[PDB]
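Fig. S4 source data, part A: sequence.
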Amino acid sequence: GVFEELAAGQQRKYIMISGKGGVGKTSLSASLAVKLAAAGHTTLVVSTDPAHSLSDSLAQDVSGGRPVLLQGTDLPLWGLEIDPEEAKREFFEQVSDFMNRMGMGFVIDQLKELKLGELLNTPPPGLDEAVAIAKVVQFVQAAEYARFSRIVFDTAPTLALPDFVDASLAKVIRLRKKLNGATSVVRGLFGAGESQDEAVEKLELLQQRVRMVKALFRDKTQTEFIIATIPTYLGVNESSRLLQALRAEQIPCKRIIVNQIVGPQQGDAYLRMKMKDQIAALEMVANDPGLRPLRKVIAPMVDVEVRGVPALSYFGNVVWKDVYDQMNQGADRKFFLLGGKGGVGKTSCSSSLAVHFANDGLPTLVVSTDPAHSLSDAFDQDLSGGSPVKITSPLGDELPLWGLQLDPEQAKAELRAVLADTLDGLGLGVISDQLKDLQLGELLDTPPPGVDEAIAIAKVVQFLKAPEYSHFKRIVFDTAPTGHTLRLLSLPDFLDASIGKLVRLRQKLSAATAVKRLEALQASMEDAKAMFRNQQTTEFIIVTIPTVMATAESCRLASALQHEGIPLKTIIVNQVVQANATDKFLTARRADQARALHHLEEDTGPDGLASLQLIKAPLCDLEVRGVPALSYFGNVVW
């Protein structure tokens, strides 16, 4: 049986459930926990979610920091909610002045102003989610709460990080045993004592608990993964590439589940469901707090998926034409940025905006920060690389637009590598440490959550120059399908961090007898930030769907981004089924499923990325919030 294999032995087996994008992944790893606890396994289900997903999906306050046993069932089950930001960083946390008389006292007070002690105390980025699952193995081999027969994991949506933190710990671990025996003033630059042996003795064990992680995922006996994906086309080949990893890094992956499939019998119930969502959300779009001032547009759902240049021109009449295209009014230049989580087809809108006022007399560059080749699939032209490309599909006619694609991961490493290029010799002058600190100076440029793309944006802000300053009048951005949009004013303090460090280095550069390299980064961001609070030339667009959850989220970000200051003047609701052809919507989405099921069943056979073992999960017509509902949803699927 499908389930029988997951509950076979008393030999502790860790179930992992990995996927992306609200597939009900929580609701099905919860079912699996329950239906396993029904089989006799003392079982623990854990989620690393600050939204406390395991709690709302269990209907108990299981969201305590340690594993808590549930009230109200004779069924043996434990849930664990782990705090990433607090707990993980918590385990991490004579007077001979005679140099003053050599005048050294000016150079020593400029190095202590680099506060390299801090940079050693900054716990490396990624630590929390790296040690999350190691904390899980504590309570189970500890058995202080109970002997756990199986463990079920709700993983964060989509192994490299445990080695990154392994490497950032060694870099910091390598430096402290070099400081255990050191001259008294050298330690003064770090604020470190004589005997370093108390801190390294525990810095290593934290490094070893990151290593047991990498050894667990590989562990052929305890561990096993299961992928979870919604039947969409993109979701299948996204999961196809996920398994590619699981076969390389030796991680056993034996099952894939597909949730949110429409069944044949009860497919007619889906539309009654889907509609009341759209009714509720639009009632809120009409009435939501703070949505009042910004302009609103309702788009009726995609006729046939927009993959063409002409298709993009007709889409332009749908969103911006029957409703007002009076965006075009203003100064000679316009900066248009569009954003939204992945799935709304904002690129189809984003692309359709450049095309619309291409032939209207306006030369307009569309910039895509989507690394998935959106623009290359949206105009159907393979617009690759960073430099602009002309657009060739139409019947011979004026095309005043272009489109450039910036990998944001490639735009970040493009930037970090620039900083690889005297003061080095001085630090190296007591013992060789330049290689370590340079890399560790960058431990303070990865901390930001969604910056890789802001790099890609400020790159083209500065592209205002005689080669282009004359060429383009309006430009339109296509943010990647993530949380680009930063609603809290971290702009000036990510900017100050830059000054804080470009002013701290000017303090030691003048003492050793570069920083204007950080001046290029200083003015470029300030040139980007200049076009963000620009009221006349710049305005924003946020693309969303009538699923009520995703709708209030689009206000949750609207109202907060408003008092931030950024002019966000339009929201788009791109995929609105309409009832007169409600029959066709069902008939279409039903096919988009089994049409994509074909694409998975045709995956190269069983070599690597596979057709390994399939689990079809019917449509979540009910809230699964109750513990019995999960017992039901679990015997349906497993």
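Fig. S4 source data, part B ends here. Residues 287 and 340 are 20 Å apart (CA to CA).
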